[model samples]
Target: SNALQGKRILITAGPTREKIDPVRFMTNFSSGKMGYAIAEVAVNLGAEVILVSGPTALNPPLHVTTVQVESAQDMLEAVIQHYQNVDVVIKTAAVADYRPKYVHVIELERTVDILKTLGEMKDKQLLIGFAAETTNVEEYATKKLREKNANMIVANDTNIVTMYRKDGEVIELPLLTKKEVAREILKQIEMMLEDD
Candidate 1:
C-alpha cells in the first residue's frame, strides 16, 4: 500500500508576481526548490498532490496535478477553491504583502493588504505557511502565523541563505512550542497523516 495512501495535499510554490506595469512587476528570488522538494517527498510517501505554482523554469515532478498562477490574488483564489478536498495545505509561495501604489491601466490608486482579503478559512484543515525573513525572523514569523490563522509556520533566514552562490546554508527555524526540530517537522507531518 502507498505510504500516503489516502492523503490529499495541496501546495503553493514560488513568488507571486505583483504587477507594476504591463511590462514590469515585483517578485522575490525564490527558486521554488524547497516547495518542490517537499512536494516530491509527499508524493513518494503516496499522497495525491495538487501543486499551485507561479511562473518558474524548473520542471515539476510526475504524477501531481499542477496549477500555474501569476499574481498573489490568483494564488489566493486557487487555494480557497481547492482547500475543501485537501487534507493538508502547504503555502510556500512568497506572496507579496503589498502591491503597487497605483495602476494606470486599471485606473486604481492606492494599495491594499492581499492577505486580509484571502479571509479566514474554515474546515479545521492543517494549514502551513512559510515566512522568509531577514531579521527578527522568529518573532515576525510567529506573529504572522497567528495573524493568518495558520496551524503552523515555517520560517527561514533568507539573509543567511544567499542564493545562486557557490556556498549556501539551509537552517530551519525552531518551532514555537517544540524543541526537537527535525522530528517535529518531517515526522510530525507523517504522524498527522497517520491519524487522519
Candidate 2:
C-alpha cells in the first residue's frame, strides 16, 4: 500500500546561516515548516529519509537522519554525502543566496547553484528541487528545473504552488496548508515512483 516503503530519501530544510560575526549572522525567515512536513510525511510512508537541515527550531519525524548545517557550503557537503545512497531526494532548504565574505563581515556574490552540482553527479537518483520566488517564478523555476536536470521542481509563490516535471508535465496546487502541500507533493511523487 506504500510506494515509499523501503525507499531511501534525502531532504534539506530550514534557512542556512551566513555568518556576519561571532554574535550576528544573516538569514531568511524559513521556518523549515514545509520541508519538515514533507520529511515527516515521507518517513510515515515508510521511507528511509536523510534530512540535512540548517538552523531550524522544528523537529522531524522518527527515523529521519538529520544532518544539521549552518552555511550554504555546509548544506552542499552534507547533501553530497548522503545523496549517494538514496533513491529520491527533495531539496527544500532556503539556502541563503549570499554569505558573509569572511571574518571581514562583508557579503559576497550569489552562492553557487547547489542542485546543479548535486544533480549532475547523481546516478539513478530521482532528484527534486524547490524554488521560492518573490517574482518571476516561472522564469526562474523553469530555468533551474532544466539547468539543474532535476527530475522535478516544486516552485512556490506566496499565492500558488507549481510542480514541474522534466517529462513536460506541469501541475499547480492552489495555496494550501504546509501539511496539505506536503501530502500532495509526496502523492505526486508516489505516482512517479510507480511509473519508474
Candidate 3:
C-alpha cells in the first residue's frame, strides 16, 4: 500500500565468501531468500531498495538496485558508501567471522563487523540487524540489539522468526514464508516511522 513511500532502504543478503585461495573459500549456506524477499516487498511498498549481496544464485528483483560483491570486505565497503543516505539499513548477509589475510597465507583473522560499525556511525537511519542461530535466539538477539545499537533485531532459525525491538517488545511469528516475514517487518517499520 505504498507504506514505505519516500523511504530509501539498504539491504545486505546472502553469504560472504572469504577467499582462502584461487579455488577455495570459507563461506556459509545462506540462500539469500529472506533478504531478496525483503527487497521485493520493500519496493512494492514504495521504498527505494538497494540490495548489496554476496555470491548468490538467485536473481535479484527487477526494480531493486543490486550491488554484487564476493567477500565480506567488499560488501562492507559497498555498504558504507551508501550508509549515510539511506533511511533504513537491513543487514541479512551471513558474513564470515574470519578470513585469511592473503590467498596463500593460512593466517585467519576476524572479519570486519559490518552491523556493529554501522550502529556506531548511524545518525537518523533505522538499523535492523539479523541473527541466525540454533538456540537462545531471543537471549542472544536482545544482547545483539543492545550491542549493535540497532533499532530492531530479527532472530531466525530458518523456520521461526522472532522480532525484538529496542523498547523491550518481542513479536514472534508463526510458520510463514520469507515474503510474509518481510511484510510483517516492513509493517513494523512503518509503525516505527509513524511514531517518529
Candidate 4:
C-alpha cells in the first residue's frame, strides 16, 4: 500500500536470552513469527526497516537490515544505537524480567526496562509496545501504553488481537492470521501518522 513510504521503522522481535550458565539460559516461548511478519510487511509497504532481533530460528526478512542479539542488554544497546534516526519503534521482544546475577537456585536481578528507557528518551518518534498476556490483557496493556509512553499497545492473548491507543481508543479484531494482523497494525500506524 506504500502507506509507510519514506518512514524509518525499528522493530524488536523474539525472546531475549539471559544467561544462566555455559550450557543454559532463561528465555521465553516467542517464535519470532509476528515480528518477522511485521518487518516483511513494513518493507513491502515501502518503509526503511531495521529489525533488532533476539535469537530465533527464522530467516531475516528480505531488504530489512537485521541486527541479531542474544541477551536483553544486547537488544537494549542495539535499539538505543538506532532509535534517534527512526520514526517508529515497535517492541515485540519478550524480554526476561530477571536474569541470574552472575544457576538453578541462582540469585536473580531485574533486567533493564528497555521500553521505559526508550520512553524517557523519545522525542519526536512513536513508540509501540506489545503485551502477550495470559490474563488481564486489556488492563495490563492499557497500563503499559501509559507507563511506557507508547503511542499504542498491541495486546494478544494467544488468540485475541486488540490495539490500545494513547488517546483511549481500542480496536479489537476478530480471529486473523499473523500476517493479516501485521497488515492491520501497519494500517493503523499509517492512520496515526496521517492524523499527526
Candidate 5:
C-alpha cells in the first residue's frame, strides 16, 4: 500500500536551450531543484516517475526514467510521445517561451510555440503548468491557466526564487475556485493526486 501506488507521473524540469550559435545558446539558471524534489517525493510515495529534464548538473533520481532534452521543442515532443501512458503531467520545466527566430543553418526562422502546443492536449489528461512571473503574478498566471486548459497551475515570482535563495513563494490555481498559497508546492501536488 503506497500512497501513490500505480500512479504514472510525468514531470519536466530545468531550463530549455535556445541556440544562438553552434557553440552559444540562451537559457535560464533554473537549478531544477523544485521539480526534482517533486519527482523524488512522488517516487517515495510509490509513483512511477518520468523526468524530462533540460541541461542540468544534478544527477537523475534512482528508480526513475529520465529523458534529456535541449530545446523546448524537444521537450514537447518527448511529452507527446509518453503522454498516452501518463496519469499526470507536471510542466515544471522553465521552458523557453521563444526560440531564435532563425538559425544559421536554414537561414529561416524556426519559431515554435511550445506552451500553446502542450496546451492543446486532450482534456482527459491532467496538465499542470508552472508560471514564474515577476509582476502581475496572479492575473497573468490565471489567464495562462485557462488559456492553456490546464487542470492546475503553480505560479511563483521568480524574482524572489532565484538560485541565490533556498526558499521561494508559490501559489496554487486549481481548475476549480479554491486557491492555496505557500512555499511547499509539492504538498499541493500530493493533495491534487489524492483528490483524483
Candidate 6:
C-alpha cells in the first residue's frame, strides 16, 4: 500500500443500465460513491487508476484515466483493453446483477459473469471484489473470497439498521458515507499491497 508510486490500479464503479428498449433500461442506486472514493485515495497515493465506469453521478478525478462504459459488455471490453498492464483490480460495482433479464429480456445461452471472467484472467494481479450491501454477508463473502479469482476480498454490511451495539455505539455506512468505506477498503488494499 505505502510502497505505491505510479502503480496501475483498475477500478470499476457505478451501476449499469441494461437496455430494455430504445427508450427504457434497468438501473439501480444511481452510481457508486464508494468506488469513486477508493479511486480518489489511490490517486492521492500516486497510483495511476483506470476507472471503468458505468453511470455515475460524480465527476471523474483529473489525475486518473477514466474509461466510461455501459453494461457488462462495455465493462468487459474496457477491462480487457487495460488488463495487460495493471497491478490491481477493485470491483466496487456489480452491474446488471439486480436487473435479471428473464422477463423483458433475451438470452443466447447463458448470461455472462463479469467477475467470474475477471477472476479467471487476473494472472498475477491483485483482484479485489466488494461484498457489500447484502444479506448473509459472511456466508456469501467467504464463498466470494474463495471463489472470485482475487488476491483479497473485503466484505461489509453497509446497510442502515439502527441498533445499539454491545459497547453501546451505533453503526451505519455509505449506507453511511462511502468515503469512509473507501478508506477502509483501501487500508486493506494497502496492506495487501505490502504483502505483495
For residues 36-62, could you state the per-residue lDDT of candidate 1 as single tens digits? Answer: 766776777788888888888867788
Pairwise TM-score winner, candidates 1 and 5: 5
Worst 10 residues of 4 by lDDT: 95-104
How accurate locally is residue 39 in candidate 2, as Cα lDDT from 0 to 100? 88
Which digits, one per residue and each the tens of the lDDT, describe model 3 over residues 1-196? 6899999999999888888889888885567888999999999999999999888888999889999988888989999999999989998853335688888638888888999999999898999988877878778889999988999999886357899998889999999988999999999888888877
TM-score of 4: 0.94
Residue 33 of candidate 2: its Cα lDDT? 85
In the range 69-112, model 6's lDDT, one tens digit per residue, is 77767777888888879888888763336444543435432346
Better of 2 and 3 by lDDT: 3
Select the stronger candidate by lDDT from 3 and 6: 3
**Alpha-carbon lDDT, every model:** 0.62, 0.81, 0.87, 0.87, 0.66, 0.68
Question: lDDT, candidate 4, residue 56?
Answer: 91
Candidate 5 lDDT tens digits, 14-97 = 878878778777775566766777777778778899999989887887988999998878887998888889877887744445
Clash tally, candidates in order: 1, 0, 0, 0, 0, 2
Question: In order, what is each prediction's RMSD in angstroms?
Answer: 7.6, 2.1, 1.5, 1.8, 7.1, 5.9
lDDT score at residue 166, model 1, on the 0-100 scale: 8
In candidate 1, which residue pairs clash? 4-45
Give the range of the ten consecutive residues with the poorest summed lDDT in model 2.
93-102
Which pairs, if any, clash in model 2?
Answer: none
Tens digit per residue, CA lDDT, model 4, 1-196:
6779999999998888888888989885567889999999999999999999888999988999999998888989999999999999998854445678974378888889989999999998999888878888888889888988999999886346999999899999999988899998999888888878
RMSD (CA, angstroms), candidate 4: 1.8
Per-candidate TM-score against the hidden true structure = 0.73, 0.90, 0.95, 0.94, 0.76, 0.79
Cα-lDDT of candidate 2: 0.81
Worst 10 residues of 3 by lDDT: 92-101
lDDT of 3 at 24: 85
Winner by TM-score between candidate 6 and candidate 3: 3
